[PDB]
């Protein structure tokens, strides 16, 4: 008996994080991954699709607060492992989504590991 292990963050010389975006087969669905240090949510987790009238998950996760204000278009999120999919109104045009949330990832993954506080 003696639980002694232990796991410490990241303090790094490194103030951006690259982060990946791939096309779907999807019209409205956007893949951003997180591709060179940190990821959104430990894997062994669950996709959870964080809605807009759903709010005590967008209360959950402060970088979806930032995706729904900023970016008003979209309708939904799915929290993935190393990914989130940003789905929109076909209004919309990813032109304006995708680098204001390549900021938000980017500024999330520097101030916590994990997207969200576990439910």
């Known amino acids: 008996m003696g639980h002694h292990h232990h796991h410490h963050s990241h ?13 779907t087969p999807n019209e409205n669905a956007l893949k951003f991954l997180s591709t060179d240090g940190e990821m959104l ?8 699709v964080i809605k807009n009238t759903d709010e005590n998950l967008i209360n959950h ?7 729904f204000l900023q970016c008003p278009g979209v309708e939904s999120l799915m ?3 190393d990914f989130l999919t940003i789905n929109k109104d076909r209004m919309v045009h990813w032109n ?9 990832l980017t500024k999330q993954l520097a101030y916590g590991e994990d997207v969200i506080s576990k439910e």
């Open 41 to 48: 949510q430990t894997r062994g987790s669950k996709s959870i």
């Open 11 to 23: 303090m790094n010389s490194q103030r951006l994080i690259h982060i990946k975006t791939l096309t």
């Open 61 to 67: 996760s402060k970088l979806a607060q930032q995706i």
């Open 79 to 81: 929290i993935g492992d």
């Open 96 to 104: 304006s989504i995708k680098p204001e949330i390549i900021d938000l």
